[model samples]
Target: EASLTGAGATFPAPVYAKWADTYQKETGNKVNYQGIGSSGGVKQIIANTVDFGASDAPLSDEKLAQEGLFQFPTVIGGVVLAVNIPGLKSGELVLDGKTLGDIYLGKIKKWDDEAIAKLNPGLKLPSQNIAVVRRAGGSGTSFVFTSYLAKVNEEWKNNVGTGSTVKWPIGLGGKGNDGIAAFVQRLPGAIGYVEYAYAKQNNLAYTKLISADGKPVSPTEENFANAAKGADWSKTFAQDLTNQKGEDAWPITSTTFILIHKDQKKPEQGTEVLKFFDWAYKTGAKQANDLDYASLPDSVVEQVRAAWKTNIKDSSGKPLY
Candidate 1:
């Protein structure tokens, strides 16, 4: 039996785990995937340690060209702001990008701060100090969250900027999505951003957010899909789906990308990787949806298939797919 290994991107780990299990049961290929954050995944791939690497933050075109690697988005999802406020329910607490930015900037120190309380007139908010939980290491979740902040808040754009890792103004550090969820569950006044799946899995109280369209929306599968509707994959698969303009769009939507080398050291492994992804593209939609991830658009999948044939190759420059 063949063995395949991958690591990266906790954002898509839940769906990937489900896909790997089903794929192995049918093909008898043992697959191992680690939920390291995107920075670790990119490093391992560049270091030639993993068969494939995953990331929510796509690399620049020049970087991919320089690295001799191929990248394509696999699944779409949302990053949600989850809170541990007592008496709050999922979607009950509403926030806008500027307020969220202020919270992360440590300006909004309490849950009952005027900015937050203004959005929730019906609920009574606590005056407890807002404990912000952030990623301890480099994280694609941070990239997406900060990217949205940069887009919607000017001060954040100029001061903090966006990347897999940023100098957080104030907060505690959690290692992965799991870590963030754990911290939120333990701390009553905590707020953390995590992928929608993690919040769902942990039953965290996720908030509604005012989207680019200026309408409050919940983090739902349809809302995520709506956010991705405006993505222009014709130019590149790494289109930004955040802050999209649709009434129901989830503002922090993102697509998780997969990275593999253009030139395969092991040709058989190259072929196996293609086979696995091809199978996923063809058959993994339901599994993805079941985990609250949106399937890639049909045209995007076709484009990726063409890229596989044109970009991926063996040592002698023969196409693997």
Candidate 2:
């Protein structure tokens, strides 16, 4: 039995854990995974310290070629705007991207600010200062989050650029999704962006977002699935879904991906990595859906298998797949 190790995005960590558990039980191969931030995963993989790395945002083709790694999407999910308002409950609060960006940009400082108040005419908003809780570490969660901010808020795009980590103009720093959820939970009037699992698990007060079509959508498996319905996966399955024009699409939806080197010193690790993913794509659908993740479509999995065969190879110039 071979042992493999990976570290990466907390976005899909829950489902990955489920997959790992079942995989080990069935195959007797041990897989060690660290639910570190995506940035940490990228650093670890590029440094050649891990068997594989995972990220919510895919690396550009140039970086992949430069680093000699191949990557593909594993699952899709949504990043929801979660709040800890004093009286406003989750889903009762509605927000558009512009207002959400304003809050993060410090333009909308108070919970009762005119912009926010306009959206919720009947809900009671506190006069307390809005405490923006953002990721302190480099994060793919932050990448998806700030990218959407950039798309809807041009001013945010100009001043507070988007990436895995950005110069946050206004906010307290939380290290990961769990950290943000915990921070927001403790602080009154605190708001943070987190993936759906964290929000649901932590019972954080999540808000509904008005999609690009100007229709309000909740962050659910169904809504996120709708957001992914028309995704052009031919473009490497890393396309942005934020504010994509759809009636029921969740505006902050994004895909999480896996990274493995094209060439490996330990072909066993390469073999193990693909074996895990092959099992996952073929047999992990129920586990993924149980955790609210949208599994890779069968068509996309076929493409990923093709990518594995073409890119991942052993020392003798043989495809690992």
Candidate 3:
């Protein structure tokens, strides 16, 4: 029996854990995964501390070329704005990109701010303080949220640019997706962005976001698939998809990645890791729906397999089994 180790991204921890358990039971090989944030995962892979690293945020081409690593999307999900406003039902709140950017930048302090009121005309908003909750560590959720903000707001682009880690203007830092969700649930008038799965699992009140086309959209498989439609996988040989465009596209759609080095310390372990994913792509599609995640399209699965064949290799300059 062979064992594999991976660490990174807390975004897909729940689903990954579920996959790992079932996989171990079925194959007799164990996968040990740690839910460290994206930045930590990148560092771990660069330091050769793990066999593979996982992240919702992909590595830049320059960084991948410099580090000699290969990254491919494994799963797709969206970042949802989960809020705690008393008397407000889930999906009743509406928000546009600019208003969200303003709130995070500390320019919009109260829930009853005029900009927000303009979006939800009839809903009663609170005049109390708006507690902004964010990830304390570097996170892919932060990257997706801030990237959308940068796209919509020039000030956010120039002054507070986006990445896995950014200088949030005002917010309390929570450790991971779970931490942020917990903080937001406990605090009144708190709003935070987390993976849709987390919000769904915790039963948090998530706001409906106005799409790039000005249509209010909830985070769903159909919407995420729309976002990923027509993506050029060839252009993403070593990068992750972030700037995709479509009318019904969810602006916060993010593709998670598995970071494997060109060389593995235990050669056979790499073989086992690839085998697991091969099985996952074939059998794991069913599990995604339960988690509110969108599985890769059949065409994309073929593309990913082609990528795996071309990239994933061992230290001997030979492909891993």
The residue pairs that clash in candidate 3, if any, are: none
- 82-183, model 2: which lDDT tens digit per residue? 898887778999999999988888988898998988998997888999989999998999999999999999999999889998999889999788899999
Candidate 3 structure quality by residue, lDDT tens digits, 1-321: 778789999887877887888899998888899998988988998888888898887778788878988887777888898999988889888998888888988999998999999999988988978999988988978888888889888778888998888888889999999999999999999999999989989999999888777788777877777788767765663333343566677778877888887666676887888888888888887777678778876767788777667777776678774
In order, candidate lDDTs are 0.93, 0.89, 0.83
Tens-place lDDT per residue, model 1, 10-32, is 99999999999999999998779
Question: Where is model 3 poorest over a 10-residue stretch in terms of lDDT?
Answer: 237-246
Alpha-carbon RMSD of each model: 0.8, 1.1, 1.7
Query: Could you tell me the lDDT of residue 194 within candidate 1?
Result: 97
- Winner on lDDT between 1 and 3 is 1
Worst 10 residues of 1 by lDDT: 82-91
In terms of lDDT, the best-performing candidate is: 1
Return the TM-score for each candidate structure: 0.98, 0.97, 0.95
Between prediction 2 and prediction 3, which has the larger TM-score? 2
Which is the winner by lDDT between candidate 1 and candidate 2? 1
